[PDB]
Amino acid sequence: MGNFD
Amino acid sequence: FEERIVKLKRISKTTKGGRNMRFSVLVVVGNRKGKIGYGIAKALEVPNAIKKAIKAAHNSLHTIEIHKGSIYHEVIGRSGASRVLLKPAPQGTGIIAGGAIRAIIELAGYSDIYTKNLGRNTPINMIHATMDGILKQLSPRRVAILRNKNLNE
Amino acid sequence: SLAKLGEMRTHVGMVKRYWNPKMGFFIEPERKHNNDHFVLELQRQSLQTAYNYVKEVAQNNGQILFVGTKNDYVKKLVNNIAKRVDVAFITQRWLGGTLTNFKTLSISINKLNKLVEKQAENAADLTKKENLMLSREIERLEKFFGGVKSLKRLPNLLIVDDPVYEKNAVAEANILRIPVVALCNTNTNPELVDFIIPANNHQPQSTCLLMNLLADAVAEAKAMPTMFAYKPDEEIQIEI
RNA sequence: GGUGCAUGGUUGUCGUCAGCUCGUGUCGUGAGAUGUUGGGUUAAGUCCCGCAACGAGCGCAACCCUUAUCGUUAGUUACA
RNA sequence: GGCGAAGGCGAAAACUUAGGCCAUUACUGACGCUUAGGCUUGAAAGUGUGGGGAGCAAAUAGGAUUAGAUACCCUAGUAGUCCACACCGUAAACGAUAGAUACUAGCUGUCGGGGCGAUCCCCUCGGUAGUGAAGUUAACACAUUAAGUAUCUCGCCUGG
RNA sequence: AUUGGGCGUAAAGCAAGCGCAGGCGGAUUGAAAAGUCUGGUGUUAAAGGCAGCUGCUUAACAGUUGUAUGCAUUGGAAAC
Ligand SMILES: CN[C@@H]1[C@H](O)[C@H](NC)[C@H]2O[C@@]3(O)C(=O)C[C@@H](C)O[C@H]3O[C@@H]2[C@H]1O
């Protein structure tokens, strides 16, 4: 998935 | 959070003009609630080896799941030619295991399970095989998502 | 949507029949042109996906480190991109252990600070040997720990020119949980990279274009100007 | 008086030989390896380039003293 | 490098014969695998019958060597090494891997069959080698010719 | 080691081959059902294993209530 927080 | 010893051994490398004697320690770490791991260490004396083993085992920590306080499906784990056979224990029967396996299963927060060992027993190899077999565990949601049916059967 | 196909003209040219059959879905019939030739539609889709992911990561202060270790072209490329955008960079490839733990990075940054703020007052006072040792230590720190001086936490992202010749860091990243974005033509293990970029780096122009595209992708996060994202021009420059 | 194959202390030898192991991390189910490896440079893991290694301690060098250049102090019982 | 099931097979030719490979557009109708018991072949040394016996040479003798040397060194000299007939059936008769059945990423050489064609390269089926991912084995190592994947049969295995 | 082991280097693949018998086997359809699956019936004694109950002060015990593989006949099923 994206948006590595 | 328990950090009980498993098997401490004397080891030594041979070198020109003397051989270096040292202690090798195998440890297993478990919160009794899901975080488990194991490690090895060697050092000249007890404290350094113990600290090294604790750090190594803490670094390799990984979680484990609980199915009704049991291992709901059979598992035959292998590593280094040492078979471990684990099968569910019905609650109300108690937990049976041998020393190293006893510590492994109690440290993982497992209520009861029926265990058997095939092949020549060896501590480190047996621990590796048992952890590989336990981390191989399946789950009803896994089979549900990989199947068309969304029920256990 | 980005970097129209009229600018990609020399995107192929990899080595002859020395690859890994782990790839193949990204490759047209190999024995038809004796070279590793890629499909460009999937190329553009992968480039767009990589751009989207890198902009999402950098939007929340996602810092990235370049991987530039090859002989001549990528050295100047990484120098230009690092001196353009305020991000850490690697000059010579890792020797192992410089990315798996922070304590070594901490002692390295402490050594850098002490060295610079002490050599600020020691350049000709004693013999040439100690001053030359100070300069050599500065240069060694540039060689290995040059770019790692602005981070307080472990790098959240890293861009690699090829998994080959840089196997140590990518293996650690497999051991670690950090996401990986990297360039790879066919000589890779696609399992070790989570954001595949089937862009061939054999031709310098394509590598330059993609590096500038990624620099502009990370540029928008810190509110700094972009140069080559939608520009209707391909970077053409004879090999140095 | 005896037991330096029961000892402390001190001494010889390899030998002023340069190697010895350490922490971290990686690899391998393991003893273990990785540094210390390869290439140049010196008597020297003195030093550096590359390498799944980074540092760190020990001995080695530098950290003392003299000889040969000079400044600078006093000139005696040298000096005259 | 090739050939045959293995041992093994290399002067030239004459005779007979063995099996193999490829396209099958041809035929019969599953007639296929393995194989207890039996049968056939089965290096080299030797035994028996008889020839031939240039060299080579265990035992045997001498000379050097060694403290001693019944050995390595050298010179001698039969069995034997050759062949015709009938025997022996031993081995590291090793890929130390029983055969068969299909199936499971690649890469680089060699040769045989087919087509295209100055050679060369090309593709297709194969023998044959090396390199090399999954996977396997305790490790070494193995890797489409498996010690992988599973099956059928025979033989073999139970501390020294 | 049917459950539940192996045969490259640790014991173990015969020196190789031809093969009698045996064991194992390409696809489709039919028939019965040789085993198998599945009912009924009669037979697997008593005592004994196992479960409940009862009287022994009470457990030990004894008695009782049931249960237990297998066999043959008989009807269904025709996937192997
Ligand atoms: C012949 N010189 C050797 C050589 O330098 C050896 N190292 C390679 C060295 O090894 C030592 O330093 C040691 O570590 C132990 C001792 C037995 O010998 C010591 O002295 C040893 C020296 O005597």
GROMACS .gro file of C-alpha atoms (C1' of nucleotides) in nm, chain B residues 11-13 15-16 20 22 42 51-52 55 124-125 128, chain D residues 19-26 28-33:
model
   28
   16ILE     CA    1   3.291  -2.446   2.373
   17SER     CA    2   3.646  -2.363   2.269
   18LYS     CA    3   3.833  -2.267   1.954
   20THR     CA    4   4.458  -2.167   1.813
   21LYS     CA    5   4.838  -2.162   1.811
   25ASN     CA    6   4.005  -2.005   2.410
   27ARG     CA    7   3.409  -1.985   2.651
   47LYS     CA    8   2.877  -1.704   2.351
   56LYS     CA    9   2.309  -1.001   2.792
   57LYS     CA   10   2.403  -1.093   2.434
   60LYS     CA   11   1.942  -0.877   2.314
  129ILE     CA   12   1.888  -2.601   1.906
  130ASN     CA   13   1.760  -2.797   1.606
  133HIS     CA   14   1.425  -2.421   1.534
  417G      C1'   15   5.023  -1.004   1.558
  418C      C1'   16   4.651  -1.077   1.964
  419U      C1'   17   4.187  -1.091   2.081
  420C      C1'   18   3.696  -0.711   2.173
  421G      C1'   19   3.178  -0.450   2.101
  422U      C1'   20   2.819  -0.399   1.731
  423G      C1'   21   2.584  -0.613   1.292
  424U      C1'   22   2.552  -0.997   0.898
  426G      C1'   23   2.544  -2.027   0.826
  427U      C1'   24   2.039  -2.515   1.195
  428G      C1'   25   2.699  -2.530   1.423
  429A      C1'   26   3.145  -2.548   1.592
  430G      C1'   27   3.274  -2.073   1.301
  431A      C1'   28   3.360  -1.710   0.945
   0.00000   0.00000   0.00000
